[PDB]
Design a protein around this ligand. Structure first.
Ligand SMILES: Cc1cc2c(cc1C)N(C[C@H](O)[C@H](O)[C@H](O)COP(=O)(O)O)c1[nH]c(=O)[nH]c(=O)c1N2
Length: 324
């Protein structure tokens, strides 16, 4: 049901791509939102729990930590990314989450101790997945050192029946400071019979909404996935123009509290948004903050925090045995 053509996509990002960021990207016009990479070996340990208090579906590890949290609002739009090096374990993890997500993605940059380097194994993991789940299956790659090797590999990958491929147009051995190769992404999109999601354009190509469609045309790709630009301000997806960072940060913080996001993750994401402004008044208050309450107070959201905490407590009582 998920279509990968002509879309704006939030790229998978460790730490950044937890539920609050995903929901905020959807608010601002992203069509598809990837979660952070999560490890198959960790996910197989988790229990699926319907959390009626938060109105979420939680995947909860044996140490009681919530590894992945989702909700009905993103069900039709969220793509689950795993790091895997074992076909049958990947498939078990996909079946664990498949009823709560719209797509399953494999990060080819992830090791086998990169998967990208081993077409035999890629073909096995991806064909096992494609055959075994009712959701579309994608993968995400970095380009190889030679143009010709890159084109042969993607032809191999494509024959596994995946629905789309995201291509970060940088070689493994080069920083984000090196220019992105639109030439290569164009050659891949020209070659492949499946949609290609261009990636790697933030900063050097993508500073405002209209840069996204420009990058898509330069790459001749079907869609564009955005990571760093969205991490800095997820209203990058909004056709009408960027929103003021204060509005965005407050909206982020509200989601983080309403979905009981761990405060260290909330703080990490805010620090990425405030990257040029750690010395601003709010920057310094954030730095000192050691709890979600203190994060909220740093942004003028103390009354919001108290009220929401009371709401979530009252919801918990309402939904307990005693009320029955
Ligand atoms: C903080 C952070 C975290 C991650 C990443 C990046 C950043 C900045 N990236 C890579 C990312 O998806 C993307 O390919 C690159 O950042 C290039 O695209 P942009 O130019 O940033 O839009 C990444 N890639 C991936 O496949 N899975 C992941 O979970 C991560 N995590």
């Amino acid at each position: 049901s998920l279509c990968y053509h002509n879309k704006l996509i939030l790229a998978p990002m460790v730490r950044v791509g937890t539920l609050p960021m995903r929901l905020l990207a959807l608010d601002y016009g992203a069509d598809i939102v990837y979660c952070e990479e999560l490890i198959d070996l960790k996910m197989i340990q988790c229990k699926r729990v319907v959390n009626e208090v938060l109105s979420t579906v939680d995947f909860v590890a044996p140490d009681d930590r919530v590894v992945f949290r989702t909700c009905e609002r993103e069900q039709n739009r969220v793509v689950f990314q795993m790091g895997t090096s074992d076909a049958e374990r990947a498939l078990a993890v996909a079946r664990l989450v498949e009823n709560d997500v719209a797509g399953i993605d494999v990060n080819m940059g992830c090791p086998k101790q990169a998967l990208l380097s081993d077409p035999d194994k890629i073909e096995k993991i991806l064909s096992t997945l494609v055959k075994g789940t009712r959701r579309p299956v994608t993968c995400k790659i970095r380009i190889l050192p030679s143009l010709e090797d890159t084109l042969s590999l993607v032809k191999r990958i494509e024959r596994t029946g995946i629905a789309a491929i995201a291509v970060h147009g940088r070689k493994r051995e080069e920083r984000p400071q090196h220019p992105v190769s639109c030439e290569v992404i164009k050659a891949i999109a020209d070659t492949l019979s499946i949609p290609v999601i261009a990636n790697g354009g933030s900063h050097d190509h993508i500073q405002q909404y209209s840069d996204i469609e420009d990058f898509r045309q330069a790459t001749a790709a079907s869609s564009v996935m955005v990571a760093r630009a969205a991490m800095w301000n997820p209203s990058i997806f909004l056709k009408e123009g960027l929103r003021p960072l204060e509005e965005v940060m407050q909206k982020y913080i509200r989601y983080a509290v309403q979905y009981d996001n761990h405060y260290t993750n909330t703080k990490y994401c805010l620090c990425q948004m405030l990257r040029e402004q750690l010395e601003s008044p709010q920057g310094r208050l954030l730095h000192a903050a050691q709890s979600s309450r203190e994060i909220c107070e740093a942004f003028g959201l103390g009354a919001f925090y108290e009220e929401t905490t009371q709401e979530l407590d009252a919801q918990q009582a309402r939904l307990s045995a005693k009320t029955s």
